[PDB]
Structures are given as C-alpha cells and as structure tokens.
C-alpha cells in the first residue's frame, strides 16, 4: 500500500484558507467559519 | 469539540480501520478474524496467533481462563516476546492494552507493522 | 432500582436538551463578536487618517 | 507539492506539541513528564512497566516519582528526552520520522552543546532526512501575522522578549529573564501554607498547577485589591481535592501571579516583565520605538491569567512617554502561537532551501547548526 | 440492574458540568459583545464628525 | 517665518500639484495597457495599486509578455505569503537581466504609488 497511505497524511493544508491567525477559537467547533 | 481532539479523531478512525484490514489479511492464514481492533485484543491471544504468525516462530502457549489476571499475563507474553526481538517500546504495558488505550493499541500495530514490514 | 432508574434516564435526556440549547445561544453571539470587532478595525483605522 | 509535509514539534519546559505543517491546529498535546515506580511490587502475573511517559504519568500521580526532563529551557536529562521523542513520533503521531523532515524549537539565550546534541540526536538515531531549529519568539511573531513588533514570551521555563523591525532582528536588544510558571507554582505552594494546607511531594505539584490554571487573576491595582480582600469574602473560591476535601482559595488568587511583576516577592532582585519589556524597547534605535509600542504581542501559556493584558498596558503606560499610544496585542489561541508559526514557517517555499541536509551534517557534523540556524 | 443504574448516574453528572460552562461562557461572551458594540457606535461618531 | 511659509506654500502648491497631477494621467495609461495584454489569459485589473498587492495579476502579466511559465504562486491569503508572491515575480525579473533599483517586496506590497508606477513602466519600457 505504501507509507503514503498506511499514514492519514493530511492532502490538504488547512492554514492556507484561513485569515488572520490571531482570531481563531479553538474551544467551540460546532461551525465550518 | 476543541480542534486538537477532533482532528486526533478523524486520523485514529482512518488509521483504526486501515490496521484492521492489514491484520485480516495476515491472520486470515489462520481461521480468525478480527471484528473490532480495541475490544478483540483485550484477551491477547489474537495478539500472540498474529505474532506466530507473522514471525514464522512459536510461541508458549497462552494461559486458560476468564480473569482480568490471566488476560494480563497474556499480552504480557506477546510484549515479552516483541522485547525479545529488539524492538522498542515505550509507555507500552500490560494494563494499557487489557484497559483499552487508543493510541497505545494503534501504537503497538503500527510498531508490528514497522518491524515486519 | 427500576423506579429510580427511569427518572434517571428521563433527566439523563432533558439535561442534553439543555446543552443543545445553551450551543445555540453562544455560536450565534460569537459570529456576532467577529462581526463587530471587524468593523470597529475599520473605524479606528478611519479616525486616525 | 509533491513532497512529504514536514513535522513541527515544540519542545517547552511544560508541554510538548506536536503536529503536521500546513494545518492550524496541533495533534499532540501532553505534558513532557516522566514518571518512575517507587513502591514494592506484589500480584506477581501483572505487567512490568519500566517507565511511564507523559499522560499516562499523570493518570497514575500515586505511585510515581515525577520527574521534569527539561528545566529552565535546558536538557538536563537526555534518555527522558529521546523517551518523549520516541513517544511522540511512534504513540502519538504513529509516523516514520525518517520519511519527515522535522521543525524544532528553542529558548533565545541557552547553551551551544543543546543545539549540537539535539542534533546529533535527531540524526544519529531517528535517522530524520533534515531539520532546522527556530526560535519560539521569531514564530511567535509569523503566528501574529505581522513582521514588526516586540514579542514577549513566558513558558513554563523561561521569558524572553526580542524585537523585531521588518524582518530585521535585534540581538544587542533580546532580553532573557528566568522567571516562568515553575516558580509561579512554587510559590503558591509556600503561601498556601498560611491556610494550613500542606503539598510537599511531586504528586501534588499537579494539583497545585491545576489550582493555579483554574483560581487565579492578576489584579489591576494590587494594594486597593488587598484591603478590598481583607474587608470581607467577596472574593473566595472553593476547590476540591481528588479524595474530597475542599479548601478555600481566598486571599490568595492575586499574590500568585503578582511575583511576574514584582520579583522581589520570590527574593530575586530582577526587574518584572512590564520593566523588562520597556527596557528591551528603549535598548532600540530612536526611529523604531514608536512602531516597537503599538505592536505588542504576548504569547505562551503564562500570560494566559486573566486582566494580565489590561495590567501590563497600565504598567507600560505610565513607563512610556504619554504623547503616543500604547497597543497590547493578545490573541485568544496565545498557548499554540509558537507552533502555529512553525506551522507557517514549513508551508513556505523558499524555507525548503534552509533544511539542513544529511549530507551537510555528514560534511560539518554537529557544529552545522550555529552556521545554518539563526 | 444495580451496574446500568451507577452508569447512568455518572453521565448525568458530566452532562450536568457541560451544560452549566456551556451557559457561564455564554453570559460572559455576551458581556463582551454588548461593551464592543458600544465602543463601536461611538468610534464610527468621532470618525464621522 | 512669512518667507518659510511663502515657500512652503510654493512647494506645496506648484511641485505637489505637478507631481501628483502627472502620476494620475500615467496611471490610467498603464493600467489601459495592462488590460489590454491581461484579455488573453482573461483577466483585469480595476485599480492599479490595490490590485497588485497579491502579486498574482504580475505573475499573470509577466506570464502573458514572456510566454514562458512561471513558479506557481503560493495559495497563501498571508501578508507573509504575499510578499513571497510579489519576491517571486521580482526574482523572475532579476534572472533576464532587467535592471530595477530601489525594488522590494513590500513596496509593492504597502502599495507605494512611485514605486509600482516605476516598475510597471521599467516592465514596459525593458521587457516589450
Ligand atoms: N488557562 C491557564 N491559565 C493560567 N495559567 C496557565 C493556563 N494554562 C497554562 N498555564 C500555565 O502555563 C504553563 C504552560 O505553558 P506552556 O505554553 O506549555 O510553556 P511551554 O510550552 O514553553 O512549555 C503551565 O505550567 C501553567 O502554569
């Protein structure tokens, strides 16, 4: 199968679509923005 | 619901069911199959047929019985045995597999997988 | 043990009802929250200039 | 990019944190704590642990002598530390670390032989194809998504602050001051003595960090606060033991965090992070003060206390000369800043350039790192 | 029986501790957002003036 | 001080006036032909200097005029990831040899009237 995919080796970077990293909350998650 | 867990959690789903299609296909060899990774490793004797199998050797045979005692000295034998074979290990005992640690268990199968590559 | 543990199980739901509810109320004050302080970043920078 | 996503791992005093580059939050977080077994061993048929490594150390406080790998930003300990390594790549991120290239950080002002052994280290035996260390401040800095600005950052181990002008770095201007959380639980652990609560062994160290996490404010105005206090018990808190007890907080919510201003309260002669601050900013050039003030960012898990930032801007107020505007910048996530700009740093494709190479530390060996990093 | 009930009980605790955070950051956050928006009124004043 | 404020006055109409009144007139030309060579790929420009702080409408152009292809742009709404957009389009100028003084990143970035203007007609004058 490989190391690529035995690993969930994320394909997408998630830091690229975001605005300004100093507003972000991490505790609540129940929305996408 | 904090993003370090849930991100934590996506990977151990993908991961849990990636490991246990793996060891279906070595232990089919053998008349067993494994329904759920956590919960079918708490007696241990599916750990030491899948290490018998996988390492072309034998191992002692695993002590009768129901008990929680009995279940630990089990794993106990397959950790002891994975010892013998100069593979590395660490924060990995006997209870934590009994118990049911996630990434202990996920841990185990990807150092299984490292080693008999 | 039977008779207390159905009032345990109706309270066990009626509880989650409530989580559910308080969810609600904090995720829309916090898209109002990014809202303002966004538009206030506009402002201040306007009354400098 | 048709290359495999590097791994970023922050290495504090407290915590380790651990992830993949490119995403915005980390994957691993635990206490870097490793335990020992102090007791005889009975039940003869039950398993034998050697060591206990991170969390689970802290599920089993009871039996365990707790032990801190790295103090003051220094590794006094080297076999705890390839033992969190160990547990961080194989338990935790369950990758091979030599498919990965890694990100490593570190204190501003620490000793040579840390960077040559943590090199050595992370070639030798994990056999990693390439690795750079970075300094927590500098990403601190890529996290608050500015380039100009002074950064004050307070771990568990250590507070450092350096400004930063458009990309350009002060030396002459870093400031280094070893006062952090370790001390801060320490001398609440002295001063709960008043109450007649006693915590003496390792054990218990936790749960006077966790009353630390959860009781604690800095106040505004520290002598109002005190007779507001000694008038009556508006303010009390009550926290529970893990076997029942309950004790009362009271008085001292306030005098914990006051010794981060006021050193002299520890018995060090050291000035307090406010004067600290201003003193590295008035170590700069003349020009570049005024953009120094209106961009200050605070980061690691210490400045996490509440009314910390509306104190410090009250303190530098006061300091700084009254006819410009004084701006403290604190974002909500401040604790994961450092890894999120290593986050950002390995998503960069002119950073792919600044690996060091195996083939360059075959060539040099371990002095590389003080010409390649920093 | 005795086993399924203790379990019960033990998830009624930890719903009963979500639920009670859930509602105090709630009103806290609220707290917040009511003061920017006044800051926010009178900033867009001074600029406009 | 009524001579200063003469003078000042001086500068402040006549050299502000002269400047600012010839920058706007030069601005509208080139971003007229900045339109006209970014129709092939399909692509337009409203303003000149707000429209070049990402940096990829450069690389577009400077794809279009050289006909050869470029390094990708970083998928990256930073004001870091900008500046390595705008730094990229400079290297790629800078290997064919293209003189450019006084040439940074961020000022393109910050959106300095003088020095965009400058590299626009430095890319008109060199380049076609
Ligand atoms: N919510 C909180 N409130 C107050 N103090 C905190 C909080 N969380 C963590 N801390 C303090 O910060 C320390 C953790 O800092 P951390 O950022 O982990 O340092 P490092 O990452 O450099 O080890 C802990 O020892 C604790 O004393």
């Given at each position: 199968?490989?190391?690529?995919?035995?690993?969930?080796?994320?394909?997408?970077?998630?830091?690229?679509?975001?605005?300004?990293?100093?507003?972000?909350?991490?505790?609540?998650?129940?929305?996408?923005? | 619901?904090?993003?370090?867990?849930?991100?934590?959690?996506?990977?151990?789903?993908?991961?849990?069911?990636?490991?246990?299609?793996?060891?279906?296909?070595?232990?089919?060899?053998?008349?067993?199959?494994?329904?759920?990774?956590?919960?079918?490793?708490?007696?241990?004797?599916?750990?030491?047929?899948?290490?018998?199998?996988?390492?072309?050797?034998?191992?002692?045979?695993?002590?009768?019985?129901?008990?929680?005692?009995?279940?630990?000295?089990?794993?106990?034998?397959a950790?002891?045995?994975?010892?013998?074979?100069?593979?590395?290990?660490?924060?990995?005992?006997?209870?934590?597999?009994?118990?049911?640690?996630?990434?202990?268990?996920?841990?185990?199968?990807?150092?299984?997988?490292?080693?008999?590559? | 043990?039977?008779?207390?543990?159905?009032?345990?199980?109706?309270?066990?739901?009626?509880?989650?009802?409530?989580?559910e509810?308080?969810?609600?109320?904090?995720?829309?004050?916090?898209?109002?929250?990014?809202?303002?302080?966004?538009?206030?970043?506009?402002?201040?920078?306007?009354?400098?200039? | 990019?048709?290359?495999?996503?590097?791994?970023?791992?922050?290495?504090?005093?407290?915590?380790?944190?651990?992830?993949?580059?490119?995403?915005?939050?980390?994957?691993?977080?635990?206490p870097?704590?490793?335990?020992?077994?102090?007791?005889?061993?009975?039940?003869?048929?039950?398993?034998?642990?050697?060591?206990?490594?991170?969390?689970?150390?802290?599920?089993?406080?009871?039996?365990?002598?707790?032990?801190?790998?790295?103090?003051?930003?220094?590794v006094?300990?080297?076999?705890?530390?390839?033992?969190?390594?160990?547990?961080?790549?194989?338990?935790?991120?369950?990758?091979?670390?030599?498919?990965?290239?890694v990100?490593?950080?570190?204190?501003?002002?620490?000793?040579?032989?840390?960077?040559?052994?943590?090199?050595?280290?992370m070639?030798?035996t994990?056999?990693?194809?390439?690795?750079?260390?970075?300094?927590?401040?500098?990403?601190?800095?890529?996290?608050?998504?500015?380039?100009?600005?002074?950064?004050?950052?307070?771990?568990?181990?250590?507070?450092?602050?350096?400004?930063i002008?458009?990309?350009?770095?002060?030396?002459?201007?870093?400031?280094?001051?070893?006062?952090?959380?370790?001390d801060?639980?320490?001398?609440?652990?002295?001063?709960?003595?008043?109450?007649?609560?006693?915590?003496?062994?390792?054990?218990?160290?936790?749960?006077?960090?966790?009353?630390?996490?959860?009781?604690?404010?800095?106040?505004?105005?520290?002598?109002?606060?005190?007779?507001?206090?000694?008038?009556?018990?508006?303010?009390?808190?009550?926290?529970?033991?893990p076997?029942?007890?309950?004790?009362?907080?009271?008085?001292?919510?306030?005098?914990?965090?006051?010794?981060?201003?006021?050193?002299?309260?520890?018995?060090?002669?050291?000035?307090?992070?406010?004067?600290?601050?201003?003193?590295?900013?008035?170590?700069?050039?003349?020009?570049?003060?005024?953009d120094?003030?209106?961009?200050?960012?605070?980061?690691?898990?210490?400045?996490?206390?509440?009314?910390?930032?509306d104190?410090?801007?009250?303190?530098?107020?006061?300091?700084?000369?009254?006819?410009?505007?004084?701006?403290?910048?604190?974002?909500?996530?401040?604790?994961?800043?450092?890894?999120?700009?290593?986050?950002?740093?390995?998503?960069?494709?002119?950073?792919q350039?600044?690996?060091?190479s195996?083939?360059?530390?075959?060539?040099?060996?371990?002095?590389?790192?003080?010409?390649?990093?920093?």
């Amino acid at each position: 199968l490989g190391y690529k995919d035995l690993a969930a080796i994320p394909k997408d970077k998630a830091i690229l679509d975001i605005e300004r990293p100093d507003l972000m909350i991490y505790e609540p998650h129940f929305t996408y923005s | 619901r904090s993003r370090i867990k849930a991100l934590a959690d996506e990977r151990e789903v993908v991961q849990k069911k990636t490991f246990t299609k793996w060891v279906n296909s070595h232990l089919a060899r053998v008349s067993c199959r494994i329904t759920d990774l956590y919960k079918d490793l708490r007696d241990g004797r599916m750990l030491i047929k899948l290490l018998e199998v996988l390492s072309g050797e034998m191992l002692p045979k695993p002590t009768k019985g129901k008990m929680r005692i009995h279940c630990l000295e089990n794993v106990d034998k397959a950790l002891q045995f994975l010892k013998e074979q100069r593979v590395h290990l660490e924060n990995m005992g006997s209870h934590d597999i009994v118990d049911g640690n996630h990434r202990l268990v996920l841990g185990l199968i990807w150092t299984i997988i490292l080693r008999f590559q | 043990d039977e008779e207390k543990m159905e009032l345990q199980e109706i309270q066990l739901k009626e509880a989650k009802h409530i989580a559910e509810e308080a969810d609600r109320k904090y995720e829309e004050v916090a898209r109002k929250l990014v809202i303002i302080e966004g538009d206030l970043e506009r402002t201040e920078e306007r009354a400098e200039l | 990019d048709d290359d495999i996503a590097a791994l970023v791992v922050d290495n504090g005093s407290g915590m380790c944190k651990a992830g993949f580059a490119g995403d915005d939050a980390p994957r691993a977080v635990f206490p870097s704590i490793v335990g020992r077994p102090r007791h005889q061993g009975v039940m003869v048929g039950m398993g034998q642990k050697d060591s206990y490594v991170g969390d689970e150390a802290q599920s089993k406080r009871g039996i365990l002598t707790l032990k801190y790998p790295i103090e003051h930003g220094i590794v006094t300990n080297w076999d705890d530390m390839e033992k969190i390594w160990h547990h961080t790549f194989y338990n935790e991120l369950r990758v091979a670390p030599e498919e990965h290239p890694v990100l490593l950080t570190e204190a501003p002002l620490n000793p040579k032989a840390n960077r040559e052994k943590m090199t050595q280290i992370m070639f030798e035996t994990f056999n990693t194809p390439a690795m750079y260390v970075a300094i927590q401040a500098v990403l601190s800095l890529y996290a608050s998504g500015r380039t100009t600005g002074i950064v004050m950052d307070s771990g568990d181990g250590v507070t450092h602050t350096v400004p930063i002008y458009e990309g350009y770095a002060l030396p002459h201007a870093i400031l280094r001051l070893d006062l952090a959380g370790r001390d801060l639980t320490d001398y609440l652990m002295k001063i709960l003595t008043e109450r007649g609560y006693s915590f003496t062994t390792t054990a218990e160290r936790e749960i006077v960090r966790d009353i630390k996490e959860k009781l604690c404010y800095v106040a505004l105005d520290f002598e109002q606060e005190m007779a507001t206090a000694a008038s009556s018990s508006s303010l009390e808190k009550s926290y529970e033991l893990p076997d029942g007890q309950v004790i009362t907080i009271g008085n001292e919510r306030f005098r914990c965090p006051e010794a981060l201003f006021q050193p002299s309260f520890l018995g060090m002669e050291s000035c307090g992070i406010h004067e600290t601050t201003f003193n590295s900013i008035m170590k700069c050039d003349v020009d570049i003060r005024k953009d120094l003030y209106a961009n200050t960012v605070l980061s690691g898990g210490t400045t996490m206390y509440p009314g910390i930032a509306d104190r410090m801007q009250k303190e530098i107020t006061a300091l700084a000369p009254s006819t410009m505007k004084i701006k403290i910048i604190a974002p909500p996530e401040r604790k994961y800043s450092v890894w999120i700009g290593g986050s950002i740093l390995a998503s960069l494709s002119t950073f792919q350039q600044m690996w060091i190479s195996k083939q360059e530390y075959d060539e040099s060996g371990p002095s590389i790192v003080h010409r390649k990093c920093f």
